Design a protein around this ligand. Structure first.
Ligand SMILES: CS[C@H]1CCCC(=C(c2ccc(O)cc2)c2ccc(O)cc2)C1
Ligand SMILES: CS[C@H]1CCCC(=C(c2ccc(O)cc2)c2ccc(O)cc2)C1
Lengths: 225, 9, 231, 9
């Protein structure tokens, strides 16, 4: 069904599948990670249904759906965060009622490094003038690509590529400008991967050195251990 | 896995 | 980067490091990690001089070149490994005399997971029928891309300028191979999505090396400095 | 650092 869709039909479905921007509870080490854990836990529930609303993802086996989500869940939260924080330079918009800067990252050990990487990614999206239609394509790619190596998925990945190009085919971009911008967007995904892994190891650092994580988050975390 | 249940809502 | 894609490719081809050998002896079966470490330590010395011959890399400052290598050295090693093992199904070719199996990976604890992904990556290059001209491009992309966002006020547009040049080079390669405009973007995308796996394998791998440092696998003096840059 | 030296060499 995904393959039989149009580029515009692809964008429209993805735009409609978007999870909502959740709010947080209304800092220190425990105070910081406490609010982030709670926020992320509620976001995951929306992400799961978002993933089921992604074309081609439903066709996958339940196991394969599970494996893909377990692999990219932090990447998807992070690229979300990055995109929300786009029009707030130097600040991270985790939630509309929770805007954080680098100085607040020093409340938790080793989080200032991951903060700057996120701020840099957000900055690069803004400088590239990333569109919302492109963003929903990228997160869809992260979902399907990040854990396919560890066939039908590649047929869908190629469709999102065509969709991304179609978006750049509009707005009057040269063919040269199309595959360059395409390359630039996909190279960012490599960095989102890095931030996720470094984020993941910090979460496991927090799990052993006992804020309490949710059962759902604890199970997404053990898939990387 | 909780994810199992949540993936078949 | 006042150079055509054909001149771009040839320069990267000429800059290619050799395939080194290991000290592995079939008569003798921790021990395996020692071989790979000494192998990678000698591979580094070639990579450093290889990086200098990458267009645009030497135009950068010394501190920037250091970071770009510190952050990408295992990625470049791993993609090199995956490329060599491309025509050896179910096997990793660390060296002509060192061809390893999905059974000797368990000789080191926790390495079996990394081998899987490496094998899967090798199987992906095989199915895609990856060309050497594309591999040398991807390698140089990793060198120039794996850092940057981990960083007077620079003006890193030069790196992106070279990165955009490497993109046009890849497109030029595929076009001459007979690929349609649609097939070009797809392959372009598929190739660059690989880099978002090599990163993963590198991160996982990197953390395994930091584990062994805290003991029974004494790393070389160069590898320790390349490792501490990731902590 | 060795990396700085080998790059300087
Ligand atoms: C561990 S480093 C930190 C860096 C910023 C992103 C953060 C995430 C995070 C990321 C995005 C988001 O919307 C919500 C939450 C996180 C995830 C789970 C958790 O228990 C706590 C935080 C990870
Ligand atoms: C610990 S994970 C392991 C997985 C296979 C690749 C391996 C590498 C490796 C990778 C490629 C290569 O040509 C040579 C060496 C490695 C690097 C440094 C080191 O001290 C030991 C090994 C890393």
């Amino acid at each position: 069904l995904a393959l039989s869709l149009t580029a515009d039909q692809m964008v429209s479905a993805l735009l409609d599948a978007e999870p909502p921007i959740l709010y947080s509870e209304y800092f220190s080490e425990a105070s910081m990670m406490g609010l982030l854990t709670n926020l992320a836990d509620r976001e995951l529930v929306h992400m799961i249904n978002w993933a089921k609303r992604v074309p081609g993802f439903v066709d996958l086996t339940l196991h394969d759906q599970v494996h893909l989500l377990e692999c990219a869940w932090l990447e998807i939260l992070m690229i979300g965060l990055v995109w929300r924080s786009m029009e707030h330079p130097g600040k991270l918009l985790f939630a509309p009622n929770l805007l954080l800067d680098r100085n607040q990252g020093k409340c938790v050990e080793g989080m200032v490094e991951i903060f700057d990487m996120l701020l840099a990614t957000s900055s690069r999206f803004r400088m590239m003038n990333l569109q919302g239609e492109e963003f929903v394509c990228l997160k869809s790619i992260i979902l399907l690509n990040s854990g396919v190596y560890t066939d039908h998925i590649h047929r869908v990945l190629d469709k999102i590529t065509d969709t991304l190009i179609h978006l750049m085919a509009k707005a009057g971009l040269t063919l040269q400008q199309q595959h360059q911008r395409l390359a630039q967007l996909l190279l960012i995904l490599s960095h989102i991967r890095h931030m996720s892994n470094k984020g993941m190891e910090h979460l496991y650092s927090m799990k052993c050195k006992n804020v309490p994580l949710s059962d759902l988050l604890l199970e997404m975390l053990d898939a990387h251990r | 896995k909780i994810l199992h249940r949540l993936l078949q809502d």
